[PDB]
Amino acid sequence: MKVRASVKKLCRNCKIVKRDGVIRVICSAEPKHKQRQG
Amino acid sequence: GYPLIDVKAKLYDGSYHDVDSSEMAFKIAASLALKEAAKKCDPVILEPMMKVTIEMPEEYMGDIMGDVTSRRGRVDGMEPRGNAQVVNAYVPLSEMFGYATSLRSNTQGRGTYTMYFDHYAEVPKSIAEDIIKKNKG
Amino acid sequence: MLQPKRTKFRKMHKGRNRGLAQGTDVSFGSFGLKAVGRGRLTARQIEAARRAMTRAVKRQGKIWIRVFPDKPITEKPLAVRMGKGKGNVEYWVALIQPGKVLYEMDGVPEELAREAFKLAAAKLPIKTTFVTKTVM
Amino acid sequence: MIQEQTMLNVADNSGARRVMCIKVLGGSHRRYAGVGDIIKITIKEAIPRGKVKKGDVLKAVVVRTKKGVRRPDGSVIRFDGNACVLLNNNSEQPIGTRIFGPVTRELRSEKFMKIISLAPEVL
RNA sequence: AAGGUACUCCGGGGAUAACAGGCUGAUACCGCCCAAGAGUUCAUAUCGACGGCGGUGUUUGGCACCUCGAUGUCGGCUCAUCACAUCCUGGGGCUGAAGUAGGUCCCAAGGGUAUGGCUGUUCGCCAUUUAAAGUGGUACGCGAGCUGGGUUUAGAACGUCGU
RNA sequence: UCGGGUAAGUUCCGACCUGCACGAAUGGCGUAAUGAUGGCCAGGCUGUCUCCACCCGAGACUCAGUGAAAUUGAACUCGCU
RNA sequence: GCCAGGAUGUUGGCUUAGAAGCAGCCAUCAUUUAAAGAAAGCGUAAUAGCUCACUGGUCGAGUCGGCCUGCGCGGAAGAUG
Ligand SMILES: [K+]
Ligand SMILES: [K+]
Ligand SMILES: [K+]
Ligand SMILES: [K+]
Ligand SMILES: [K+]
Ligand SMILES: [K+]
Ligand SMILES: [K+]
Ligand SMILES: [K+]
Ligand SMILES: [K+]
Ligand SMILES: [K+]
Ligand SMILES: [K+]
Ligand SMILES: [K+]
Ligand SMILES: [K+]
Ligand SMILES: [K+]
Ligand SMILES: [Mg+2]
Ligand SMILES: [Mg+2]
Ligand SMILES: [Mg+2]
Ligand SMILES: [Mg+2]
Ligand SMILES: [Mg+2]
Ligand SMILES: [Mg+2]
Ligand SMILES: [Mg+2]
Ligand SMILES: [Mg+2]
Ligand SMILES: [Mg+2]
Ligand SMILES: [Mg+2]
Ligand SMILES: [Mg+2]
Ligand SMILES: [Mg+2]
Ligand SMILES: [Mg+2]
Ligand SMILES: [Mg+2]
Ligand SMILES: [Mg+2]
Ligand SMILES: [Mg+2]
Ligand SMILES: [Mg+2]
Ligand SMILES: [Mg+2]
Ligand SMILES: [Mg+2]
Ligand SMILES: [Mg+2]
Ligand SMILES: [Mg+2]
Ligand SMILES: [Mg+2]
Ligand SMILES: [Mg+2]
Ligand SMILES: [Mg+2]
Ligand SMILES: [Mg+2]
Ligand SMILES: [Mg+2]
Ligand SMILES: [Mg+2]
Ligand SMILES: [Mg+2]
Ligand SMILES: [Mg+2]
Ligand SMILES: [Mg+2]
Ligand SMILES: [Mg+2]
Ligand SMILES: [Mg+2]
Ligand SMILES: [Mg+2]
Ligand SMILES: [Zn+2]
């Protein structure tokens, strides 16, 4: 889990979702691409 | 402080004084010449390179080649000898240290290799710099 | 790092940075990076942004820097008290007002230019915007 | 009841005659070692041409204490001196070949079974 | 018409310094943004040039607002109490995580969190432990609780400077 | 810095000389004996300490008698932010 | 969304140990087409493989992306409460 101020898509499979007032980058191809805004 | 190799010296001109001419003097003069040559000829450090012949099942070929290109080595080529692809490569002797264990780790203890000195090649500038520092002190 | 080759005087009063900028049009190229905020662009910042955009365009087309750091900025050494004369010059800056075209570019596609200017803008302390040359 | 600075006698033929405990092993702020406890020692007095020399830092097992050991009936066994048996720093096995003086049943473990065999008496 | 005073003295000043507090945050420490690169290949496992934006009050400083009809000052001892930017133990994501063992980040402050050699030391280095030997705040916590080694009275000497 | 001593020695002892900035009666270098003199080490010894326990006395406490002191604008004199 | 196709000179060439869409550098094409990049990704020593774009079928009404602008969100750790 990468916790950063600047969260973004790093691929075409990476997806931006907001959960419980948190912007997150969930990915179906690469676990390295999983990010949380914080 | 390493023996200088692969250098040609051409004695084109010189001088002598019959009275003061001594073979020892000329030997000293020769040394001085080599010294000044170094100041202008850009002496570089060379490292012993070894031809490595690695035989393994094709399944582990990618890993073997990766290890070589990681140890500052170059793959000279490959050949499908028997059922175990043979990879020919040149790798620095210093880098080759510990290849046996890594080879067996990568090939599931199904890999074998033979290393024999091939040539002397220039050491990477960074590594060479370290060598000079070490030899200096 | 841009700096005047010679100056009439070594040091300059602080001054103020009010008003709108002069030179608000893309005058040399097709695309430009315009300042929307107010501040001081240092020479090092100007260099960093230039190096970034130059690499991005991969030595294609031409780049004009419309800003020069002509104002000397002094600083006092540490552990020195107030007074005892003005400090020594440490770096050179350019005063920027809203509307100033900082960089212009030509000889590239707009998409490459927009990307290159984005990379350079990240090295700048002021907010910027992409602009294209107009007929009038 | 051995602590740091406590001088012990040696109950083996390793060559050491007097050792000093420099650490009680096996826990933070651990105060004392009794019979069966392993300590870190330094050799203070050794005989010429021994297995060990003066100034050596190794391990030892305490085998006799003036404080003594308690038995499950409330009985006590006390000795006249504090005595230890030197061990290898790594293997923690006896350096000597012979044990001198009595030992206790508190050393009846797999680790210290050699001492029990070599010991003249186990009390 | 030149100096010395630690042998000193008087009148004054927090109008003006040293200590601690305050304001400030350059500097310091912590975090983030951009990503050239390093990482065999692969920016972002780990790391990160050139530059950019913050946070803390936390070092070196700036200022001279409080105290000069007195706010005892280093280190130790005794006794602590808080923060969390977590040293150990608990939970978890990623990993360049086979296992063992690590790296890195997130969550978590309940409890726990060496003895010695040397030196006034804080510290540091060293020896040997430990699950770990945390980082800070508290008048650099604590002398109407202790100490008095450091340091800044009067004695004396050396080097040095000076007739 | 090197050597000794210690498990570990910014001190000590023996060297080295690179004397910031020794040096010859504002004496130089030695020196037996002497010293409530400065530094360092060892044996003995121990509550100095690990880590304090118990005991004997004088106070402290209670009762009777006598009976101070510094200080003090006035007080109906709590915590926190 | 879903069901299909997603190619042929050709592995473009050079370079490259190897480089074949997917190391790099030059090119930079043509062909059959409904359409298919001398390849946008994953993947491989290299290939392959796995996609995608593109396109065709199906489906049956809106849909997609910039620009300006109002109010919010994360970025955001401290010491007695
Ligand atoms: K005077
Ligand atoms: K931050
Ligand atoms: K990678
Ligand atoms: K004062
Ligand atoms: K504390
Ligand atoms: K982890
Ligand atoms: K805790
Ligand atoms: K204070
Ligand atoms: K004190
Ligand atoms: K007080
Ligand atoms: K008192
Ligand atoms: K004289
Ligand atoms: K004399
Ligand atoms: K003496
Ligand atoms: Mg006075
Ligand atoms: Mg004032
Ligand atoms: Mg005032
Ligand atoms: Mg102050
Ligand atoms: Mg930087
Ligand atoms: Mg301050
Ligand atoms: Mg003022
Ligand atoms: Mg005050
Ligand atoms: Mg007063
Ligand atoms: Mg936290
Ligand atoms: Mg607590
Ligand atoms: Mg709490
Ligand atoms: Mg609870
Ligand atoms: Mg210590
Ligand atoms: Mg204090
Ligand atoms: Mg503290
Ligand atoms: Mg007192
Ligand atoms: Mg007090
Ligand atoms: Mg004193
Ligand atoms: Mg005096
Ligand atoms: Mg003199
Ligand atoms: Mg003089
Ligand atoms: Mg020494
Ligand atoms: Mg001592
Ligand atoms: Mg000496
Ligand atoms: Mg003299
Ligand atoms: Mg003379
Ligand atoms: Mg004289
Ligand atoms: Mg003398
Ligand atoms: Mg009375
Ligand atoms: Mg209060
Ligand atoms: Mg906000
Ligand atoms: Mg709170
Ligand atoms: Zn992804």
Tab-separated table of C-alpha atoms (C1' of nucleotides) and ligand atoms in Angstrom, chain F residues 34-35 37-39, ligand 14:
chain	number	residue	atom	x	y	z
F	34	U	C1'	60.873	13.295	54.434
F	35	G	C1'	55.146	14.858	53.309
F	37	U	C1'	50.904	17.104	49.178
F	38	G	C1'	48.749	15.647	43.494
F	39	G	C1'	47.787	11.156	40.108
H	14	K	K	54.261	10.951	46.497
